[PDB]
Design a protein around this ligand. Structure first.
Ligand SMILES: CCn1c(CO)nn(-c2cc3c(C(C)C)cn(-c4ccccc4C)c(=O)c3cc2F)c1=O
Ligand SMILES: Cc1cc2nc3c(=O)[nH]c(=O)nc-3n(C[C@H](O)[C@H](O)[C@H](O)COP(=O)(O)O)c2cc1C
Ligand SMILES: O=C(O)c1cc(=O)[nH]c(=O)[nH]1
Ligand SMILES: [Cl-]
Length: 366
């Protein structure tokens, strides 16, 4: 395990990234993954890593965040990498191109990326048919502890945001274990204002009504994904709405439009969302706040700057039931998944936790 980890991190990934433009590298990764052209995921998930949340068993708590597989092209390969769950998207109702290229920027000195993809999407119909081709394969994966999430976006030119999300619920809800109402992209004008109170309640009420109208075996959990850049007022409002409406969970967080002091990359002042190490503690502290504001009663998927077991455990102890990563894969490659899992298991044992479940929210009980 550590042989591949070292070779990928120290040699292969920096060599490939030096040869390719960042979006070309992303596209090749999706292709390689879809073909199963992957190193051995030698790590054997233990019982200590199993989590039951959102109406499902998760074999391990480490998922691939939205954005890597926007169009649901690489789901099976992502499970092959050792992720306990996969999230695809964001998917918009109609196909759209997204922003002009270049729209992805590497900050290797910061272990960070900035992106402004702008919801490039094949659209709901294409993704629906892609998922339908493997629907029963997924049902078996889910039953075996490997659930599927689908992240829903809105078209750039839509005049009714709630209707775009409702369309997504109707089309992809029946193929998903959970849906995500992504109200936190930094790269669609007006999107993040959907995080504000009266409008948020109206939007989410409509989404939940649509979800509730699906047949039982086709009825997903609904999560809201939030930004790391919210005001205290915004966080309080979101917590209140989520509890009022019975939203199933939160994903905390998307990328940041802030630029923390200390970024070194030449491209630090590009427009877009920043991910990776500089986001990490901003995301952990957002988890911590949302867990407290929801009394520990609302499952949180923690995301932002996770690249080690320590990073994962810090988010779990702050209140996450599950974690996701994306940016670390760009630096470390596929072996990062097993690395995080191995390190997390070791830390759980070292800190006296019987398993992941026992660690969820543990900092709040100190
Ligand atoms: C943020 C956009 N973005 C960037 C640029 O910022 N990079 N990136 C990734 C690239 C790669 C690549 C490229 C370098 C060929 C290979 N592989 C890999 C290696 C060996 C075997 C199987 C694969 C898939 C990965 O895992 C991988 C993952 C990524 F996230 C990505 O999504
Ligand atoms: C290239 C790229 C594209 C992304 N696209 C999406 C997206 O379509 N929907 C979404 O909810 N989050 C998207 N994200 C955000 C990630 O899901 C995640 O919240 C964020 O990158 C923090 O995790 P990380 O530091 O492990 O990358 C994207 C991130 C990156 C880097
Ligand atoms: O498509 C994108 O630009 C994108 C969407 C999202 O939610 N987050 C992000 O960082 N980028
Ligand atoms: Cl770059």
């Amino acid at each position: 395990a550590t042989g591949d980890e070292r070779f990928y991190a120290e040699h292969l990934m920096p060599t490939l990234q030096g040869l390719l433009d960042p979006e070309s590298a992303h596209r090749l990764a999706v292709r390689f993954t879809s073909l199963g052209l992957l190193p051995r995921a030698r790590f054997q998930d233990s019982d200590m890593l199993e989590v039951r949340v959102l109406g499902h068993k998760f074999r391990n708590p480490v998922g691939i965040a939205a954005g890597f597989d926007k169009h649901g092209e690489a789901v099976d390969g992502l499970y092959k990498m050792g992720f306990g769950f996969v999230e695809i998207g964001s998917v918009t109702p109609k196909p759209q191109e997204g922003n002009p290229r270049p729209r992805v920027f590497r900050l290797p000195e910061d272990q960070a990326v900035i992106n402004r993809y702008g919801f490039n999407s094949h659209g709901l119909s294409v993704v629906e048919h892609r998922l339908r081709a493997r629907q029963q394969k997924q049902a078996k994966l889910t039953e075996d502890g490997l659930p599927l999430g689908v992240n829903l976006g809105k078209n750039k030119t839509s005049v009714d945001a709630a209707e775009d999300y409702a369309e997504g619920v109707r089309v992809l809800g029946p193929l998903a274990d959970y849906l995500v109402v992504n109200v936190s992209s930094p790269n669609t004008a007006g999107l993040r204002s959907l995080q504000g109170k009266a409008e948020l309640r109206r939007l989410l009420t409509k989404v939940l009504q649509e979800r509730d109208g699906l047949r039982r075996v086709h009825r997903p959990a609904v999560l809201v994904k939030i930004a790391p850049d919210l005001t205290s007022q915004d966080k309080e409002d979101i917590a209140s709405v989520v509890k009022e409406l019975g939203i199933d969970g939160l994903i905390v967080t998307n990328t940041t439009v802030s630029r923390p002091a200390g970024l070194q990359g030449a491209l630090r002042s590009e427009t877009g969302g920043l991910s990776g190490k500089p986001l990490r503690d901003l995301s952990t502290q957002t988890i911590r706040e949302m867990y407290a504001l929801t009394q520990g009663r609302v499952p949180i998927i923690g995301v932002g700057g996770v690249s080690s077991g320590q990073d994962a455990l810090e988010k779990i102890r702050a209140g996450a039931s599950l974690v996701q990563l994306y940016t670390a894969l760009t630096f470390w490659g596929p072996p990062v998944v097993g690395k995080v899992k191995r390190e997390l298991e070791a830390l759980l044992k070292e800190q006296g936790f019987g398993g992941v479940t026992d660690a969820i929210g543990a900092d709040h009980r100190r």
